[PDB]
Amino acid sequence: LQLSLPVHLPDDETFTSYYPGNDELIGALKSAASGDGVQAIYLWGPVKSGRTHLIHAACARANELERRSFYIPLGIHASISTALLEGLEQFDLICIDDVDAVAGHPLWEEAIFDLYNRVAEQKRGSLIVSASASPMEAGFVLPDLVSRMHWGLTYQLQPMMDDEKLAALQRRAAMRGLQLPEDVGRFLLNRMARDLRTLFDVLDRLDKASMVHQRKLTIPFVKEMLRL
Amino acid sequence: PLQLSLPVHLPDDETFTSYYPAAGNDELIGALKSAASGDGVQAIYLWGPVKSGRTHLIHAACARANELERRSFYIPLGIHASISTALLEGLEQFDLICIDDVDAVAGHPLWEEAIFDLYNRVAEQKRGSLIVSASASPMEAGFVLPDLVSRMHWGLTYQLQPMMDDEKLAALQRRAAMRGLQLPEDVGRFLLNRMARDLRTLFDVLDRLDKASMVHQRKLTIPFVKEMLRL
Ligand SMILES: Nc1ccn([C@@H]2O[C@H](COP(=O)(O)OP(=O)(O)O)[C@@H](O)[C@H]2O)c(=O)n1
Ligand SMILES: Nc1ccn([C@@H]2O[C@H](COP(=O)(O)OP(=O)(O)O)[C@@H](O)[C@H]2O)c(=O)n1
Ligand SMILES: [Cl-]
Ligand SMILES: [Mg+2]
Ligand SMILES: [Mg+2]
Ligand code: NA
Incomplete structure (x- = not known):
């Protein structure tokens, strides 16, 4: 059991x-x-x-x-x-x-x-x-x-205010020293149904993947890592 | 830790x-x-x-x-x-x-x-x-x-x-019966009302009531159920 x-x-x-x-x-x-x-x-x-x-x-x-x-x-x-x-x-x-x-x-x-x-x-x-x-x-x-x-x-x-989510994201990315282009943040936010918990789980995966591959968070890289 | x-x-x-x-x-x-x-x-x-x-x-x-x-x-x-x-x-x-x-x-x-x-x-x-x-x-x-x-x-x-919402009493009575517990209609209706018709809660409570009934050799009644469930 x-x-x-x-x-x-x-x-x-x-x-x-x-x-x-x-x-x-x-x-x-x-x-x-x-x-x-x-x-x-x-x-x-x-x-x-x-x-x-x-x-x-x-x-x-x-x-x-x-x-x-x-x-x-x-x-x-x-x-x-x-x-x-x-x-x-x-x-x-x-x-x-x-x-x-x-x-x-x-x-x-x-x-x-x-x-x-x-x-x-x-x-x-x-x-x-x-x-x-x-x-x-x-x-x-x-x-x-x-x-x-x-x-x-x-x-x-x-x-939590829906229009404050992007600010929350950019703050969490900054605290990781993770460079997140503004537009890529906006893409991720809206691709995750504007759900912060999902977004922050994804941000962690992308932070690690960026280190592993020594690559910036571009649209092509995010799409590839997340199978979007 | x-x-x-x-x-x-x-x-x-x-x-x-x-x-x-x-x-x-x-x-x-x-x-x-x-x-x-x-x-x-x-x-x-x-x-x-x-x-x-x-x-x-x-x-x-x-x-x-x-x-x-x-x-x-x-x-x-x-x-x-x-x-x-x-x-x-x-x-x-x-x-x-x-x-x-x-x-x-x-x-x-x-x-x-x-x-x-x-x-x-x-x-x-x-x-x-x-x-x-x-x-x-x-x-x-x-x-x-x-x-x-x-x-x-x-x-x-x-x-x-x-199940049909109207079948909840029958469902309660059936599961009680399968464990040897007779659940009268009045007690069943009282409990359904009291617990907002939530079957999970009710099924959880029927187990305590089974034992209470056997220990005290008493049929379920509304007063007895109130005592035993701290209602
Ligand atoms: N003031 C807040 C509120 C939520 N959040 C985030 O928003 C997401 C949802 O928060 P949560 O799962 O704690 O929400 P509930 O448990 O309140 O439903 C999580 O990723 C939190 O870390 C935040 O970073 N700052
Ligand atoms: N046909 C059914 C459906 C539910 N149930 C019971 O109804 C309650 C709620 O079912 P559940 O927790 O599996 O419901 P969900 O997971 O679907 O939300 C539980 O006590 C189930 O055992 C039942 O006895 N017979
Ligand atoms: Cl897996
Ligand atoms: Mg929660
Ligand atoms: Mg469930
Ligand atoms: Na298999």
């Missing part, structure tokens, strides 16, 4: 790389990640607003500081057990992405509530969760659970 | 037998069984609306493979933000590979290349079968790489028919 799924933490998702109304939020996550923050943080916002990025960045920071993190993408609740939450309070940072994937589920709600209390009781670290709505609007039912969420810090992420 | 993996667990009650026999899926299910058993089917792409049964059927295919002691691997591609295309390499050890929600990366050129390459490796010899699920047909899901769409259509493609 299959016991696990290999996962990885993208190395370009850090607090620095995040495209800059989000300041207090970052400081709270950094503090949590370092052992100096609140016991519970709840981050919410619309799809593609950067919830996963920021969770990844918190885990990255905790790892930097030789602190142990555990990440759960709760969107895949159909293939995992509430038993997974047991003993996680032994970690310095526990992150549950898309915790609202199980909103209204009596068994998951009780298990998560129990985890909140165990993390609090251990006093070593923090639980960070993300959702697409506030605690009182995401559909959580267990009143005690909603209380734990509401009593921690709660941050709303503002939506 | 660094996290290398996420524990997962195939639900034991999601089999071909437990599936509610919604009309219109006999051919698809026969194909899934063949792929799971190694009886000849090499690749299946099944698609349908949310809650139609795609993950259940993938789980059932894995369950069937596991009972035959065939090696299966399940990838929920919805979590692509936390996995690498490198995961698709080295799966040569497997009799069955399942990619749930493969359309999560539709249009992503690196994932499309990697998936195309996986199709080729699976199709190269009889050993190994691939099952993938999506919310739309290979074209309508927005896969871009022409070679990938061609490979998907070299395999079998099926639209999954969901």
